[PDB]
């Protein structure tokens, strides 16, 4: 009947889960660049900067 | 136009090649920043600014 | 190396750099290390006619 009996497995998947997606989510940052992805970079302009 | 009434046109709706610009040597200071100027022809925009 | 250019194209010796004789008649790499000298000769390599 009742449930939230199982908290600690359910923290660990959540926990496995949400560093997965942060993970996955930093790669949308310019880090000071001109775009966040590199075809663009690449295809604008040539290589010495 | 004078400096201080710089003319300003918008270009759009055309197919421009930029190389009879860069090949041409009647210019003294052809200088491009964001862009290398040898990739214009790869390159589609919208509303061009001159 | 040694020749002799037009006064206005000395900026086209450079190492990453675009040009008619820069693409036609001399190349730099981008990579090159050493020195670049230049010195006027109107006096000599010019003709009055």
């Known amino acids: 009947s009742t449930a939230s009996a199982l908290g600690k497995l359910q923290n660990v998947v959540n926990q496995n889960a949400q560093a997965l997606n942060t993970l996955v989510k930093q790669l949308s940052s310019n880090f000071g660049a001109i775009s966040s992805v590199l075809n663009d970079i690449l295809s604008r302009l040539d290589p010495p900067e | 136009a004078s400096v201080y009434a710089w003319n300003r046109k918008r270009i759009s709706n055309c197919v421009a090649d930029y190389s009879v610009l860069y090949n041409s040597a009647s210019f003294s200071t052809f200088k491009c920043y964001g862009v290398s100027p040898t990739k214009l022809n790869d390159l589609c925009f919208t509303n061009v600014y001159a | ?49």
Do not use: H
Not at chain 3, 2 to 31: C, H, M
């Open chain 3, 1 to 49: 190396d040694s020749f002799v250019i037009r006064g206005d194209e000395v900026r086209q010796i450079a190492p990453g750099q675009t040009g008619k004789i820069a693409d036609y008649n001399y190349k730099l790499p981008d990579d090159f290390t050493g020195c670049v000298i230049a010195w006027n000769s109107n006096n000599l390599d010019s003709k009055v006619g």
